[PDB]
Amino acid sequence: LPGVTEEALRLKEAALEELAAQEVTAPLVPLAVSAFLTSRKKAAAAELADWMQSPEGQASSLESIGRSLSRRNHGRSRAVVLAHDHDEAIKGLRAVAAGKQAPNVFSVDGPVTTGPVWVLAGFGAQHRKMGKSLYLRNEVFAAWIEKVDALVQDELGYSVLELILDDAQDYGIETTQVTIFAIQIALGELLRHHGAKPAAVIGQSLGEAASAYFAGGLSLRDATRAICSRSHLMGEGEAMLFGEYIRLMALVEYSADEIREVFSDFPDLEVCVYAAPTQTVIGGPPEQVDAILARAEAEGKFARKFATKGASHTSQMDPLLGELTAELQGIKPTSPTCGIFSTVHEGRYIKPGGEPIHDVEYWKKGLRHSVYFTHGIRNAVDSGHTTFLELAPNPVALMQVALTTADAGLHDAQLIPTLARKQDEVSSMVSTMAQLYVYGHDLDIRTLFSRASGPQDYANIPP
Ligand SMILES: *[C@@H](O)[C@H](CCCCCCCCCCCCCC)C(=O)O
């Protein structure tokens, strides 16, 4: 396998140079508090805040306090205050104490019943600097990026890391896919590193490759093969599209049943994505695409044309299917080591230990056919899931998950983002992991702090 390219090393040197010269912002510190009883939890938050108001407490670094907190027994009733300084922490703890809500405070009476679903989508989520910050500041994250970087170099001949590190480089159809995949793989292994794991995975479109890997349905290598193949064929295919060959994609706020109706006016439109229960992404000849939009606006419905000259998940894709078959020959579909809600196979569930689904044909069917995303999520809700965690550079899919959950009578779900444009990426992950903790999912909160060197790494937190 190829190593990290000299150009990446150069860009990295310059990135760390830029980084060294920034004003140093206060880290986000997760402060855990638990008990068998909420009432005990509440009072413990009270004592802890009281003491933090005191000189001894005021003299103890938030980090040292959180470290000690992370070493207590973690009860059924859990809370986390996310804080940058003592005041934020004290204010936050008062909330926990009063049982009141606040943005930086999470507090639940008992652990969530069922394990989390990992949502891996990616469309719409890309942005200039995605994953650069976390790449420079998290070794685990970084090591995983470099592993996908190396594999993509092998399959395609270029370095995804270079794209991440180079502020002047923007993303196209092909490079979005492989890079968002890189970030997805890396976020999920970071999450695994801290002891977290998915109960089930669901893929959306682009994200199906990462979902396959995390569900243990394919090795990293083959999953990389899967995203690489589709990406370049799609990216190279759409660049060649002009005039009468062009096919647009567009989100319209119509349900599946509204579409059956609406479509009788447009004979060449197809469904790309059933995104939400009244949000559908369609595709076809640009005049028809323009007309379904015009008629959406004439009804006060949301409608958004995508930046592309070709429609994935439509008949247009047929000519690619042959080369796709050939380029994926040899991949080894394995048996899922967790649940998969397959949005390719109509949102249906596959059981851990079930038969392999990720065969060459699956990728062929994935690209050709509709993405049943709202049905997947609905399936998940119905069978008990309430925690949906999205591995993305921007939590765009959670916006869809929200509409499906609400529609299904689940009015409070645990919708957990990861990275977000214009949010600190380290703070982001600390918050993700804090949530997993508070809802009582697997997460070794001890790992959010480094091994203590001396006794100053601890705090005299009240009994
Ligand atoms: C899912 O997120 C993702 C959607 C990305 C949109 C890319 C546009 C599709 C490209 C069209 C290629 C034209 C090929 C030429 C045929 C002759 C997805 O991967 O589906």
mmCIF file of all heavy atoms in Angstrom, residues 131-156, unseen atoms left out:
data_model
loop_
_atom_site.group_PDB
_atom_site.id
_atom_site.type_symbol
_atom_site.label_atom_id
_atom_site.label_comp_id
_atom_site.label_asym_id
_atom_site.label_seq_id
_atom_site.Cartn_x
_atom_site.Cartn_y
_atom_site.Cartn_z
ATOM 1 N N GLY A 131 -13.482 17.706 8.009
ATOM 2 C CA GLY A 131 -12.508 16.770 8.550
ATOM 3 C C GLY A 131 -11.054 17.212 8.651
ATOM 4 O O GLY A 131 -10.214 16.446 9.128
ATOM 5 N N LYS A 132 -10.734 18.427 8.202
ATOM 6 C CA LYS A 132 -9.348 18.921 8.279
ATOM 7 C C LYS A 132 -8.931 19.146 9.735
ATOM 8 O O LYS A 132 -7.914 18.632 10.191
ATOM 9 C CB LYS A 132 -9.160 20.203 7.444
ATOM 10 C CG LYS A 132 -7.846 20.943 7.707
ATOM 11 C CD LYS A 132 -7.561 22.014 6.665
ATOM 12 C CE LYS A 132 -6.190 22.643 6.878
ATOM 13 N NZ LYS A 132 -5.744 23.463 5.713
ATOM 14 N N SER A 133 -9.745 19.914 10.447
ATOM 15 C CA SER A 133 -9.531 20.213 11.853
ATOM 16 C C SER A 133 -9.341 18.948 12.720
ATOM 17 O O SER A 133 -8.321 18.804 13.405
ATOM 18 C CB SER A 133 -10.692 21.056 12.364
ATOM 19 O OG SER A 133 -10.364 21.671 13.581
ATOM 20 N N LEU A 134 -10.302 18.025 12.676
ATOM 21 C CA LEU A 134 -10.203 16.767 13.450
ATOM 22 C C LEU A 134 -9.007 15.922 12.996
ATOM 23 O O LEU A 134 -8.423 15.188 13.799
ATOM 24 C CB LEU A 134 -11.496 15.944 13.353
ATOM 25 C CG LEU A 134 -11.736 14.839 14.391
ATOM 26 C CD1 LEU A 134 -11.752 15.393 15.809
ATOM 27 C CD2 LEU A 134 -13.028 14.081 14.121
ATOM 28 N N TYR A 135 -8.645 16.033 11.713
ATOM 29 C CA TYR A 135 -7.511 15.294 11.197
ATOM 30 C C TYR A 135 -6.226 15.774 11.871
ATOM 31 O O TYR A 135 -5.267 15.019 12.032
ATOM 32 C CB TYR A 135 -7.370 15.438 9.679
ATOM 33 C CG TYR A 135 -6.060 14.829 9.250
ATOM 34 C CD1 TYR A 135 -5.965 13.461 8.986
ATOM 35 C CD2 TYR A 135 -4.887 15.598 9.204
ATOM 36 C CE1 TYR A 135 -4.753 12.879 8.656
ATOM 37 C CE2 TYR A 135 -3.673 15.022 8.880
ATOM 38 C CZ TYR A 135 -3.615 13.665 8.608
ATOM 39 O OH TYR A 135 -2.413 13.084 8.276
ATOM 40 N N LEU A 136 -6.189 17.044 12.244
ATOM 41 C CA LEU A 136 -4.940 17.620 12.721
ATOM 42 C C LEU A 136 -4.856 17.418 14.210
ATOM 43 O O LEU A 136 -3.788 17.529 14.800
ATOM 44 C CB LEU A 136 -4.848 19.119 12.378
ATOM 45 C CG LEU A 136 -4.876 19.561 10.894
ATOM 46 C CD1 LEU A 136 -5.125 21.058 10.768
ATOM 47 C CD2 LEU A 136 -3.606 19.146 10.158
ATOM 48 N N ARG A 137 -5.992 17.114 14.822
ATOM 49 C CA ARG A 137 -6.108 17.221 16.270
ATOM 50 C C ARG A 137 -6.511 15.921 16.957
ATOM 51 O O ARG A 137 -6.527 15.855 18.164
ATOM 52 C CB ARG A 137 -7.074 18.341 16.605
ATOM 53 C CG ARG A 137 -6.636 19.679 16.033
ATOM 54 C CD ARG A 137 -7.694 20.739 16.231
ATOM 55 N NE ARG A 137 -8.085 20.787 17.631
ATOM 56 C CZ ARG A 137 -9.178 21.381 18.106
ATOM 57 N NH1 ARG A 137 -10.025 22.009 17.294
ATOM 58 N NH2 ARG A 137 -9.416 21.351 19.415
ATOM 59 N N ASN A 138 -6.830 14.894 16.177
ATOM 60 C CA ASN A 138 -7.138 13.589 16.719
ATOM 61 C C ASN A 138 -6.387 12.464 16.004
ATOM 62 O O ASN A 138 -6.700 12.122 14.864
ATOM 63 C CB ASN A 138 -8.645 13.335 16.677
ATOM 64 C CG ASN A 138 -9.028 12.035 17.372
ATOM 65 O OD1 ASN A 138 -8.664 10.937 16.922
ATOM 66 N ND2 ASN A 138 -9.761 12.151 18.469
ATOM 67 N N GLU A 139 -5.409 11.884 16.696
ATOM 68 C CA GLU A 139 -4.568 10.821 16.147
ATOM 69 C C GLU A 139 -5.364 9.602 15.668
ATOM 70 O O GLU A 139 -5.035 9.015 14.631
ATOM 71 C CB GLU A 139 -3.549 10.379 17.189
ATOM 72 C CG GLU A 139 -2.379 11.329 17.363
ATOM 73 C CD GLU A 139 -1.321 10.784 18.312
ATOM 74 O OE1 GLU A 139 -1.689 10.251 19.389
ATOM 75 O OE2 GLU A 139 -0.117 10.896 17.978
ATOM 76 N N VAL A 140 -6.392 9.208 16.426
ATOM 77 C CA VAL A 140 -7.193 8.050 16.030
ATOM 78 C C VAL A 140 -7.885 8.394 14.719
ATOM 79 O O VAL A 140 -7.767 7.620 13.754
ATOM 80 C CB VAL A 140 -8.205 7.576 17.101
ATOM 81 C CG1 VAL A 140 -9.034 6.417 16.564
ATOM 82 C CG2 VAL A 140 -7.483 7.111 18.361
ATOM 83 N N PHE A 141 -8.559 9.560 14.684
ATOM 84 C CA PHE A 141 -9.232 10.045 13.484
ATOM 85 C C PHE A 141 -8.267 10.091 12.313
ATOM 86 O O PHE A 141 -8.558 9.549 11.236
ATOM 87 C CB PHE A 141 -9.868 11.432 13.699
ATOM 88 C CG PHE A 141 -10.683 11.915 12.520
ATOM 89 C CD1 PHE A 141 -11.936 11.351 12.234
ATOM 90 C CD2 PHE A 141 -10.190 12.913 11.682
ATOM 91 C CE1 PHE A 141 -12.686 11.783 11.148
ATOM 92 C CE2 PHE A 141 -10.934 13.352 10.597
ATOM 93 C CZ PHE A 141 -12.188 12.780 10.330
ATOM 94 N N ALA A 142 -7.107 10.705 12.560
ATOM 95 C CA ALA A 142 -6.046 10.861 11.568
ATOM 96 C C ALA A 142 -5.573 9.532 11.017
ATOM 97 O O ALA A 142 -5.452 9.367 9.802
ATOM 98 C CB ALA A 142 -4.876 11.639 12.153
ATOM 99 N N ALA A 143 -5.318 8.575 11.899
ATOM 100 C CA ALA A 143 -4.814 7.286 11.443
ATOM 101 C C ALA A 143 -5.818 6.622 10.505
ATOM 102 O O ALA A 143 -5.417 5.955 9.553
ATOM 103 C CB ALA A 143 -4.477 6.372 12.623
ATOM 104 N N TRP A 144 -7.115 6.816 10.759
ATOM 105 C CA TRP A 144 -8.137 6.149 9.933
ATOM 106 C C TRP A 144 -8.289 6.786 8.580
ATOM 107 O O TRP A 144 -8.440 6.080 7.573
ATOM 108 C CB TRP A 144 -9.469 6.003 10.668
ATOM 109 C CG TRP A 144 -9.427 4.837 11.622
ATOM 110 C CD1 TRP A 144 -9.158 4.864 12.996
ATOM 111 C CD2 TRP A 144 -9.599 3.414 11.297
ATOM 112 N NE1 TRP A 144 -9.168 3.594 13.532
ATOM 113 C CE2 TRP A 144 -9.429 2.675 12.566
ATOM 114 C CE3 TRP A 144 -9.874 2.698 10.133
ATOM 115 C CZ2 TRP A 144 -9.543 1.288 12.632
ATOM 116 C CZ3 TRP A 144 -9.980 1.294 10.218
ATOM 117 C CH2 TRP A 144 -9.819 0.612 11.443
ATOM 118 N N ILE A 145 -8.227 8.121 8.556
ATOM 119 C CA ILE A 145 -8.169 8.895 7.327
ATOM 120 C C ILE A 145 -7.012 8.397 6.450
ATOM 121 O O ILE A 145 -7.211 8.035 5.289
ATOM 122 C CB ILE A 145 -8.062 10.423 7.614
ATOM 123 C CG1 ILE A 145 -9.372 10.960 8.227
ATOM 124 C CG2 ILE A 145 -7.675 11.209 6.356
ATOM 125 C CD1 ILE A 145 -10.615 10.802 7.354
ATOM 126 N N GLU A 146 -5.815 8.332 7.018
ATOM 127 C CA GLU A 146 -4.644 7.849 6.273
ATOM 128 C C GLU A 146 -4.826 6.417 5.763
ATOM 129 O O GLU A 146 -4.300 6.059 4.707
ATOM 130 C CB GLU A 146 -3.376 8.017 7.105
ATOM 131 C CG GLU A 146 -3.189 9.454 7.594
ATOM 132 C CD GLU A 146 -2.005 9.645 8.529
ATOM 133 O OE1 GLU A 146 -1.247 8.685 8.764
ATOM 134 O OE2 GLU A 146 -1.828 10.766 9.054
ATOM 135 N N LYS A 147 -5.606 5.605 6.473
ATOM 136 C CA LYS A 147 -5.869 4.237 5.990
ATOM 137 C C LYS A 147 -6.796 4.238 4.778
ATOM 138 O O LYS A 147 -6.560 3.499 3.826
ATOM 139 C CB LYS A 147 -6.400 3.310 7.095
ATOM 140 C CG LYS A 147 -5.964 1.859 6.916
ATOM 141 N N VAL A 148 -7.828 5.084 4.799
ATOM 142 C CA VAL A 148 -8.709 5.220 3.632
ATOM 143 C C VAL A 148 -7.969 5.949 2.515
ATOM 144 O O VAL A 148 -8.080 5.585 1.335
ATOM 145 C CB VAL A 148 -10.037 5.926 3.967
ATOM 146 C CG1 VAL A 148 -10.898 6.052 2.718
ATOM 147 C CG2 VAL A 148 -10.793 5.146 5.039
ATOM 148 N N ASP A 149 -7.175 6.945 2.899
ATOM 149 C CA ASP A 149 -6.338 7.662 1.951
ATOM 150 C C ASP A 149 -5.486 6.684 1.142
ATOM 151 O O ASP A 149 -5.463 6.734 -0.089
ATOM 152 C CB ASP A 149 -5.452 8.677 2.674
ATOM 153 C CG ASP A 149 -4.521 9.413 1.728
ATOM 154 O OD1 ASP A 149 -3.489 8.822 1.356
ATOM 155 O OD2 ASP A 149 -4.844 10.561 1.339
ATOM 156 N N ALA A 150 -4.810 5.777 1.843
ATOM 157 C CA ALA A 150 -3.952 4.796 1.190
ATOM 158 C C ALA A 150 -4.744 3.883 0.261
ATOM 159 O O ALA A 150 -4.328 3.648 -0.864
ATOM 160 C CB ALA A 150 -3.182 3.989 2.217
ATOM 161 N N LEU A 151 -5.894 3.393 0.718
ATOM 162 C CA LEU A 151 -6.709 2.507 -0.114
ATOM 163 C C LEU A 151 -7.238 3.176 -1.387
ATOM 164 O O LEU A 151 -7.227 2.560 -2.460
ATOM 165 C CB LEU A 151 -7.869 1.927 0.686
ATOM 166 C CG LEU A 151 -7.475 0.930 1.769
ATOM 167 C CD1 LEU A 151 -8.623 0.759 2.752
ATOM 168 C CD2 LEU A 151 -7.049 -0.407 1.178
ATOM 169 N N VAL A 152 -7.705 4.422 -1.262
ATOM 170 C CA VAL A 152 -8.201 5.180 -2.414
ATOM 171 C C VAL A 152 -7.055 5.456 -3.406
ATOM 172 O O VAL A 152 -7.202 5.225 -4.610
ATOM 173 C CB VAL A 152 -8.929 6.477 -1.975
ATOM 174 C CG1 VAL A 152 -9.326 7.318 -3.178
ATOM 175 C CG2 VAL A 152 -10.156 6.146 -1.129
ATOM 176 N N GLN A 153 -5.910 5.917 -2.898
ATOM 177 C CA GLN A 153 -4.699 6.049 -3.730
ATOM 178 C C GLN A 153 -4.502 4.799 -4.588
ATOM 179 O O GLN A 153 -4.194 4.892 -5.775
ATOM 180 C CB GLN A 153 -3.440 6.253 -2.885
ATOM 181 C CG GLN A 153 -3.289 7.626 -2.271
ATOM 182 C CD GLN A 153 -1.880 7.888 -1.751
ATOM 183 O OE1 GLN A 153 -0.919 7.959 -2.526
ATOM 184 N NE2 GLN A 153 -1.753 8.054 -0.440
ATOM 185 N N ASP A 154 -4.707 3.635 -3.980
ATOM 186 C CA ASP A 154 -4.514 2.372 -4.667
ATOM 187 C C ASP A 154 -5.562 2.135 -5.746
ATOM 188 O O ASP A 154 -5.232 1.737 -6.859
ATOM 189 C CB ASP A 154 -4.531 1.227 -3.659
ATOM 190 C CG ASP A 154 -3.527 0.163 -3.981
ATOM 191 O OD1 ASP A 154 -2.333 0.376 -3.677
ATOM 192 O OD2 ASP A 154 -3.930 -0.882 -4.532
ATOM 193 N N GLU A 155 -6.828 2.384 -5.419
ATOM 194 C CA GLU A 155 -7.907 2.159 -6.377
ATOM 195 C C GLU A 155 -8.014 3.253 -7.447
ATOM 196 O O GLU A 155 -8.469 2.987 -8.555
ATOM 197 C CB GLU A 155 -9.264 1.995 -5.676
ATOM 198 C CG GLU A 155 -9.364 0.812 -4.726
ATOM 199 C CD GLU A 155 -9.239 -0.536 -5.417
ATOM 200 O OE1 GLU A 155 -9.835 -0.711 -6.499
ATOM 201 O OE2 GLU A 155 -8.556 -1.431 -4.866
ATOM 202 N N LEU A 156 -7.609 4.478 -7.130
ATOM 203 C CA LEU A 156 -7.922 5.594 -8.024
ATOM 204 C C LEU A 156 -6.735 6.406 -8.478
ATOM 205 O O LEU A 156 -6.784 7.009 -9.546
ATOM 206 C CB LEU A 156 -8.997 6.492 -7.415
ATOM 207 C CG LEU A 156 -10.444 6.386 -7.937
ATOM 208 C CD1 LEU A 156 -10.778 5.095 -8.662
ATOM 209 C CD2 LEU A 156 -11.442 6.653 -6.823
#
